[model samples]
Target chain A: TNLPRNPSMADYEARIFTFGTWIYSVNKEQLARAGFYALGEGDKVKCFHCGGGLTDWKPSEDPWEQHAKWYPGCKYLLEQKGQEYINNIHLTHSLEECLVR
Target chain B: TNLPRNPSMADYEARIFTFGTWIYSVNKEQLARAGFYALGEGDKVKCFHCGGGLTDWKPSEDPWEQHAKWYPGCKYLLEQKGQEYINNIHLTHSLEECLVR
Candidate 1:
């Protein structure tokens, strides 16, 4: 029952296709690596694994760090990054350093 | 590993105590009946079984309905209300009728 929002984007290529005509501060490669696919709406991207969405990214923002910051409940994020990493982001990092707003 | 956010409030009595000083539009009995324990923070409450939190409850809102509306993944709700009931809320209800904001 751990289904994602867009299972079709589970394929990395399918996710890459979402950013075919994109231009955003967060790198498309890094975003896709961090399991994000474009929503094509004001820099919004949703994780293929958790359905967690983020938007309004800055150039300095990291995709993985932001994923851990906003959606630590994500099982995929936990699977890939581990709880320690998520806890590091949650308990130690600056909210302004991570959140877009 | 399905631990709740506030495992101490898993007890019904523990949940009830949080609402000892309650004053809000939603009935504390109804909320407690729906497995909610008060957070005592601006009418915010959390589900004892699921750990899902909600706030700004309206007078017209049904605790059970609002529970299903925002956090359908709650296993206690699924155990109590069953899939069909949650599906009914997800597919047919109005957000304005359910959400606080």
Candidate 2:
């Protein structure tokens, strides 16, 4: 990931503040904390750290998990969540390569 | 929840800054935005608004969702996330049980 397009959103509160009147299954504050900022295009959201984008979240979907799944290379994800977290996410999210995709 | 035990943590920046050398599975920034502050004892975090506490997070777990799950009655939650969100959380958290009582 190059430099984040929306660098100001790096502040968690600014990110959290952006989730006003949201219309998604995901929690606004959590998504912001997960490094996401709204794209101002429907429910689309992009991460401020890795610039990874995700949208159309399921009712029970978790923001952090989504970030790790789509953008595992995120430095913010690695530094904040640690490597074990990412490993564990893939390990469980995949149910492992031994039996699933 | 009768006046937050940690009212000074109302500021998101103040809370976000507390993740120094943190040792938890959840993102510190998000947790703070969700109204949490460090307890200085392991990964234990208590919401600044509702004074709700959560710990022992699983990998990829989101802070906001955990807050909603355990403290749906939190005013700050209701305000920032809205009723539909809490209602949705209840609906997903339990199909047969009432989330708001």
Candidate 3:
């Protein structure tokens, strides 16, 4: 059930050009490493495999954290970063939300 | 390359609640039919399979059209909707972009 429906690119570089100039607060290298590229609209960044994206970055946001927070179901993020990473993000975010309430 | 990284939900309803109230210009039913649920931030919507999403809806936009335009590599969009549907979207969008140039 957690299998990837689409095969990831042979190398992350192949997916990088989709972002164009990528003149944003986040580093292009970090974005590519996290499997994201610019979506050509605002600061929106999209994950290549999961197809999930996040925008309105505040300069303090980490791409991987946003990816896990927004699209926990992404197989590529899980495959590359592992379930432990995913769990930590959700766990922390859940706690933060709890504190807010 | 165009396979789904994630299987779409058994039904669109499973994905609908990610967006609460969904009071945008587009119909929630239309969004569900096209396989999108709210991303709980801004007007962003993500596809169940492709994980692709779009934001800044103009009220005249169509979810299926945006899906094909932004995430042509999505397999679910191709599988559920067919290659012809995908091609037409790209072709028309391509022509429009060409005209602008």
Candidate 4:
């Protein structure tokens, strides 16, 4: 899959996503401003659950989605796969049903 | 849930998923990579305050179950939905929750 590689896009740079726990996506952007890519895009969104990042992740395709090997983890929807896991930071459930998809 | 859609599985590249926050991971897999969709498997053996990435993620799941999303700032648990609030990023809730199951 010869996906469009953002040449200027370093690993998690430019619009590249890095590790962030803040929502308000704009805040993520601020980090981006500080030289770090926020999750998805800096659109003032919140975490899907806590409604914290209250921002819409800019419509950007995850580069890793196109270049999985270049990064880490897998994008399948099973256990031990994809954002389905590490994404668990807070919730009111059993942390087991996250794979129910 | 339209699950089982890992077609060709090449998001993060060979793995799919991107993003990182400096965790123990496989060390090199530890570009401290952090991207969702990075898993035909999960392995968040632990979040920041936790331990390692594990296949057990499947058996354990994340705390944010069912499309749960978050973006850090959780003082109110929910944003004002389009309003410049009087909320400050700092002097804020040093008290937090690592729901990252």
CAPRI band for model 1: incorrect
Best by lDDT: 1
Model 3, B1-101: lDDT tens digits are 55454465637667766655777887677777787878778888778777887888987887787888888877777777776566666655544454453
Over B63-87, each residue of candidate 4 has an lDDT whose tens digit, in order, gives 3221112333322212221111112
Taking all chains together, each candidate's TM-score versus the true structure is 0.45, 0.46, 0.44, 0.17
Mind giving the per-residue lDDT tens digits that candidate 1 earns over A5-91? 778988878888999879776789989988999987889899998898999898799999999988888887887777556765654
**Could you tell me which residue pairs clash in candidate 3?**
A5-B3, A5-B4, A5-B5, A51-B51
- In Å, residue B30's CA in model 1 sits off its true spot by 51
Arrange candidates by DockQ, highest first: which order?
Answer: 4, 2, 1, 3
Q: Which residue pairs show collisions in model 2?
A: B35-B48
Q: lDDT at A97 for candidate 3? A: 52
What overall lDDT goes with each candidate model? Answer: 0.80, 0.78, 0.72, 0.29
1 versus 3: better lDDT goes to: 1
Once superposed on the true structure, which residue ranges of model 2 sit more than 4 Å away at CA?
A1-5, A93-97, B1-101
Place model 2 in a CAPRI quality band. incorrect
Interface root-mean-square deviation (Å) of every model:
15.0, 12.6, 19.1, 11.3
